[PDB]
Structure 1
Amino acid sequence: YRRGYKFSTYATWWIRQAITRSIADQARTIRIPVHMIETINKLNRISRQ
């Protein structure tokens, strides 16, 4: 709290990180590593636009 910021501002980053890291590790039968998941997500975001 010494930083003087609202709690939610800090907490949201950790929550997003945890959720996304898990959805990368689990959720596939054959486990693609994290970095490849990031690259595939970039690929898909570029393809739509």
Structure 2
Amino acid sequence: ITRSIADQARTIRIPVHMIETINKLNRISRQMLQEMGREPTPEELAERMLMPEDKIRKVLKIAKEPISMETPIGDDEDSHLGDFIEDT
């Protein structure tokens, strides 16, 4: 059961380490918060990890749902999320 939901979980394919890299930076964020009491700035963790600081920000942009289309916005009658995007 940990093999099937290990890849084909979301509606779209998702890598393995891409979801294992999130909780990796989690069990350390509160680790420095329970001691010092301040938010771990992207400077001290840049020396303990293999990620610089710039490219690591674009990684979070990938980790999403992202979002459906047939979802009410304002009119809640005929207006849909995928009905406001112009065509090229």
* TM-score normalised by the chain length of structure 2: 0.29
When you count helix as a share of all residues, which structure comes out higher?
Answer: 1
* TM-score normalised by the chain length of structure 1: 0.40
More relative contact order, 1 or 2 (CA 8 Å, 6+ apart):
1
